Symmetry: D2
Subunit: 114 residues, 4 copies
């Protein structure tokens, strides 16, 4: 299945935060309604934050995360969870190699804000 | 039900990150095996990160999150999700008032690291 | 927080299935837009299905699950999870006593159907 | 990523339940520690239960779900969710065609029992 794609409510503020856990430098692309609106680049093997931004979901509410390392696409896994019928998390893991830890870049999207 | 308590594997490094979305200053207490090991404090209505740390789950693996505002306990909600049978997220929302957005302090725990 | 309350897409078919794991006979009440539309009763300590029905979420999309054992309300836990940005589960556990296994009645709501 | 593989606690009773939502007859294969221990076969476009069984996770705790329709493997999506640090759901959707509803066979695994 396609992974890393989430339908948010339209025209809604959300947070996006990326963490790195790999020898490789991670490149995280954030697309809103099929346009790149943020790119995070960084390297850590200890969960450093390589980007954190507030964005708007735009007319369609479509948010897509893509992860690569020097142009090679990582394999993605994702899901959305809703707590108390109101608090939303859209969660992404990614794998750049063969160990299947899926933490090489970790992306957390949260809404609502405020 | 008790919320904000998670059993991690023993002796495991994990990340903990807190976000704020409230008029009130949030205090996030992190306990590992019933001992406070981190306290994050901050105020934001726009998802500022008020703390991010790497911790070890120790012998027992017990991690607990408590959220308060000037000593008054917020109401908590939580769940754990596992992707690809390997990537773990432990998630907490909290509510300090009556609007039930549950985002007043948001806490994300992730493992494995590295 | 209130637990067992989910906003589904309006006017949408969904499944509801309940399982029992307790000495006590479980009563599961399903409300759609504040009206009881299904009641499941049964006893099992081995996960027997005590009911499964297809319902419509109606104009408001509100679905609420209540669980009781001989007239006493059980304590509820819940969350919603979305896979592949399409497949939805609303999940409820319940506890009728002191052991906090939260499996005494387990309810799974799934959509879309068809 | 590999999907439909879960590490359960070892030597633990669990429930597995399959639902069908497709024109095609679904065949669900359940493996515990790499041995087939159940096969569910059935057809429904309205969420009928095509199998429900209690199984044990054995020494290794490994559970794998595979879905096929008339010999063609369906595409899988999955995740695990834990409520109240105790109640576990391992969730699988599957897609047998082109519409990407991922509900063609839905598989729910739940533990603990009893
Ligand atoms: C009107 C106001 O300032 N409300 C904020 C609330 O203050 C009340 C105060 O007016 C008086 O009634 O005493 C109350 C306690 O008895 C309380 O102090 O304080 C809330 C707690 O900080 C605050 O809500 C928080 O912050 C908001 C920005 C929002 O993130 C909420 O989720 C959060 O719980 C009240 O702020 C208003 O909240 C409403 C929603 O209920 C709107 O967001 C308003 O824009 C906020 O001003
Ligand atoms: C031996 C080594 O350095 N392996 C890392 C591997 O290196 C590749 C390099 O050997 C080859 O010549 O070039 C390719 C690109 O064309 C690679 O650059 O690179 C992967 C991806 O960066 C590393 O795995 C990542 O970092 C690890 C620290 C870990 O977070 C892992 O999850 C992540 O995918 C390889 O590093 C090794 O990974 C293993 C586990 O497979 C151990 O963690 C080792 O300690 C670590 O060096
Ligand atoms: C024309 C035809 O017979 N198509 C078959 C699919 O059924 C149609 O699917 C579409 C959506 O793609 C829509 O529901 C139509 O009403 C169906 O007739 C069939 O798809 C499978 O069965 C569907 C009922 C639906 O559950 C879909 O998600 C599922 O994958 C496929 C595979 O059985 O066969 C097609 O020939
Ligand atoms: Ca890796
Ligand atoms: Ca890694
Ligand atoms: Ca609030
Ligand atoms: Ca708030
Ligand atoms: Ca119980
Ligand atoms: Ca029980
Ligand atoms: Ca389909
Ligand atoms: Ca279908």
């Amino acid at each position: 299945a396609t992974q890393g794609v989430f339908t948010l409510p339209a025209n809604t503020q959300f947070g996006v935060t990326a963490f790195a856990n790999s020898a490789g430098t991670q490149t995280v692309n954030v697309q809103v309604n099929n346009e790149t609106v943020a790119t995070f680049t960084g390297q850590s093997t200890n969960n450093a934050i390589i980007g954190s931004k507030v964005l708007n979901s735009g007319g369609g509410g479509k948010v897509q995360i893509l992860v690569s390392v020097n142009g090679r696409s990582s394999d993605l896994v994702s899901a959305q969870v809703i707590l108390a019928n109101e608090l939303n998390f859209a969660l992404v893991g990614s794998e750049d190699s063969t160990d299947n830890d899926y933490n090489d870049a970790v992306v957390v999207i949260n809404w609502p804000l405020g």
